[PDB]
Design a protein around this ligand. Structure first.
Ligand SMILES: *[C@@H]1O[C@H](CO[C@@H]2O[C@@H](C)[C@@H](O)[C@@H](O)[C@@H]2O)[C@@H](O[C@@H]2O[C@H](CO)[C@@H](O)[C@H](O)[C@H]2NC(C)=O)[C@H](O)[C@H]1NC(C)=O
Ligand SMILES: [Cl-]
Lengths: 214, 196, 214
């Protein structure tokens, strides 16, 4: 196959900015490249074919460039309705493939998260499992590292994360991360902590509790 | 008096695949291993005949079809294939007796900024019959609104350009193709090899 | 005017079958390149199958032998017969007009297909209790299926500060979700906070009062 790589999300811009989204084909596809735009809950719609030809209908602020293995989508002045995900796609080969997509979300000032840790409820422990939850509230930008630590040992492979969509009132994110343990192992350990790394914090903020201790 | 193979293989202009050329060859002597032994072709597949024994054989007539396609489309020039080319441009029969010969022609056929003289048929309601040449330019109606010869949404010019360009993708580069068909009818066999 | 409308999607167990359907208008299915493209939740786009107007059909290797594309020109309808479904086939399936060479210039809105062996189950609702200006509290809506649930606070009276996170799919095949709210820590012992959880598929309605721990 041919693998299409785009940059990671999100891309932060404001109304009026000039935005460029790149695309990298793992081999030469000459100029057989397409660009699609997708809003959440809606199907994609085509913007650019043959790498640089505007689809009939698409506003003129959209433009495409490139050949061989590197391509570029460009929005001269970003409009309010241009916040979406953009996929590239090589066509005119035996099997088409898309890039993973690049989402362009709203730009704001850096905001550090407020961090909360929640122990398992006595209700849940009686049922045999323990979920420790760590909340990162209203932060910007999207990138944030949540490191679980149990009796000071860094925990990997037993936590899951979920992020809210960018807030419409203040364009921040919130993050929930659940660490899941058997009840039996939950009580083999004393200190539970999550360590939050984010560019709005001078140093990693840690919130912790000692199991059983009020 | 030799068969005018050079007139087919060494023509300096080739046709678009949708409008493939056909030279009908007859009343001549053909040394096939002139082509067989030159080793200039990235493809030389024969069907229903042994390429070396060809110079011992006679046929009523031989047909040489020629055209340009993409390198990665040369696989479609074979019996039993499907795809844009096989279906809508040039179709071999399942019982094909002939040879399929191809070679990379990027030097001659790739034009900077796109060589928009080489086209293929992109839209067609139905698959071609074998050895059918369709040169229609009727506007293809993809919707329920008749097009009345005017392009527009759902109203597509049926042909697409290859736009052969300098590209480092070999599959995307143009190849010149010669298809030899061997016809054997209840008539004189006017196209013979050296040995007979 | 022009339209592509998918249907036939829904919930099915691994090994099961499902026939997708795409009713077109103004587009004539039998004269177009008609495609199916799918999107796993939160993932990218994957082309599935094509049917040429002339009859030729192609398939992604991930579905060869199991899916079959077809059409009924009497009904101006495209079909996708999916056999031997696996969980990895879970996606929104889009019907798209391919304008030649896998250039998808018109997409239906899509129909979701969930392949799972999980049993339908209502969630358990556990408290995320506030700790000793601003306090955070929440609800852990754990171990339900299928999607979705809804979460309110104080039957809607509380809406400011509320983040209901996207559900994560656990190793067990069951979803889990958190709903949190930040409130003035002064109100903790004076104001009552209840989360109202609704999971229609199992006819579950739960109201959990969240309060600080003694
Ligand atoms: C296609 O042409 C090549 C090369 O031919 C040259 O240009 C022609 C216009 C004509 O003037 C030739 O005399 C030129 O040589 C042919 O290959 C030659 O093949 C002969 C036969 O074996 C050999 O003696 C020569 O040395 C070759 N010369 C070169 C430059 O390759 C080739 O056979 C022609 N194709 C066909 C199908 O006839
Ligand atoms: Cl192709």
């Amino acid at each position: 196959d041919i693998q299409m790589t785009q940059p990671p999300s999100p891309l932060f811009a404001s109304v009026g900015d000039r935005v460029t989204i790149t695309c990298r084909a793992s081999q030469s596809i000459s100029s057989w490249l397409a660009w699609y735009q997708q809003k959440p809950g809606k199907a994609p719609k085509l913007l650019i074919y043959k790498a640089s030809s505007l689809e009939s209908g698409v506003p003129s602020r959209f433009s495409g460039s490139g050949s061989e293995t590197e391509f570029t989508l460009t929005i001269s002045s970003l409009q309010p309705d241009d916040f979406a995900t953009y996929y590239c796609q090589q066509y005119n080969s035996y099997f088409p493939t898309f890039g993973q997509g690049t989402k362009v979300e709203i730009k704001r000032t850096v905001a550090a998260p407020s961090v909360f840790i929640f122990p398992p409820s006595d209700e849940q422990l009686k049922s045999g499992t323990a979920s420790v939850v760590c909340l990162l509230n209203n932060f910007y930008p999207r990138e944030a590292k949540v490191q679980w630590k149990v009796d000071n040992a860094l925990q990997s492979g037993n936590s899951q994360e979920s992020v809210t969509e960018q807030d419409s009132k203040d364009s921040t994110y919130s993050l929930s991360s659940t660490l899941t343990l058997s009840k039996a192992d939950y009580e083999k350990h004393k200190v539970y902590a999550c360590e939050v790394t984010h560019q709005g914090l001078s140093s990693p903020v840690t919130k912790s509790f000692n199991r059983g201790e009020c | 008096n030799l068969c005018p193979f050079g007139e087919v293989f060494n023509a300096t202009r080739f046709a678009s695949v949708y409008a493939w050329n056909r030279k009908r060859i007859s009343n001549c002597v053909a040394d096939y291993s002139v082509l067989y032994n030159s080793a200039s072709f990235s493809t030389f597949k024969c069907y229903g005949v042994s390429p070396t024994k060809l110079n011992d054989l006679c046929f009523t007539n031989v047909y040489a079809d020629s055209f340009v396609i993409r390198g990665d489309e040369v696989r479609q020039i074979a019996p039993g294939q499907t795809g844009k080319i096989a279906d809508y441009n040039y179709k071999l029969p399942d019982d094909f007796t002939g040879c399929v010969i191809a070679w990379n022609s990027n030097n001659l056929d790739s034009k900077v900024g796109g060589n928009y003289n080489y086209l293929y048929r992109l839209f067609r309601k139905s698959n071609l019959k074998p050895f059918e040449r369709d040169i229609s330019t009727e506007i293809y109606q993809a919707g329920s609104t008749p097009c009345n010869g005017v392009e527009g949404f759902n109203c597509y010019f049926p042909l697409q350009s290859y736009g052969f360009q300098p590209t480092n993708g070999v599959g995307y580069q143009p190849y010149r193709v010669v298809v030899l068909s061997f016809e054997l009818l209840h008539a004189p066999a006017t196209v013979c090899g050296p040995g007979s | 005017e022009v339209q592509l409308v998918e249907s036939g999607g829904g919930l099915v167990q691994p090994g099961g079958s499902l026939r997708l359907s795409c009713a077109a208008s103004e587009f004539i299915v039998s004269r177009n390149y008609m495609s199916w493209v799918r999107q796993a939740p939160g993932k990218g786009l994957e082309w599935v199958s094509v049917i040429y107007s002339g009859g030729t059909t192609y398939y992604a290797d991930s579905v060869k032998g199991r899916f079959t594309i077809s059409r009924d020109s009497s009904k101006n309808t495209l079909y996708l017969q999916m056999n031997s479904l696996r969980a990895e086939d879970t996606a929104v399936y889009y019907c798209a007009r391919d304008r030649g060479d896998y250039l998808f210039d018109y997409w239906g809105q899509g129909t979701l297909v969930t392949v799972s062996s999980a049993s339908t189950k209502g969630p358990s609702v556990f408290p995320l209790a506030p700790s000793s200006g601003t306090a955070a509290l929440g609800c852990l809506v754990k171990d339900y299926f299928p999607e979705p649930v809804t979460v309110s606070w104080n039957s809607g009276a509380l809406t400011s500060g509320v983040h209901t996170f996207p559900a994560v799919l656990q190793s067990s095949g069951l979803y889990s979700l958190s709903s949190v709210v930040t409130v003035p820590s002064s109100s903790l012992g004076t104001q009552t906070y209840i989360c109202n959880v609704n999971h229609k598929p199992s006819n579950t309605k739960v109201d959990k009062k969240v309060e600080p721990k003694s």
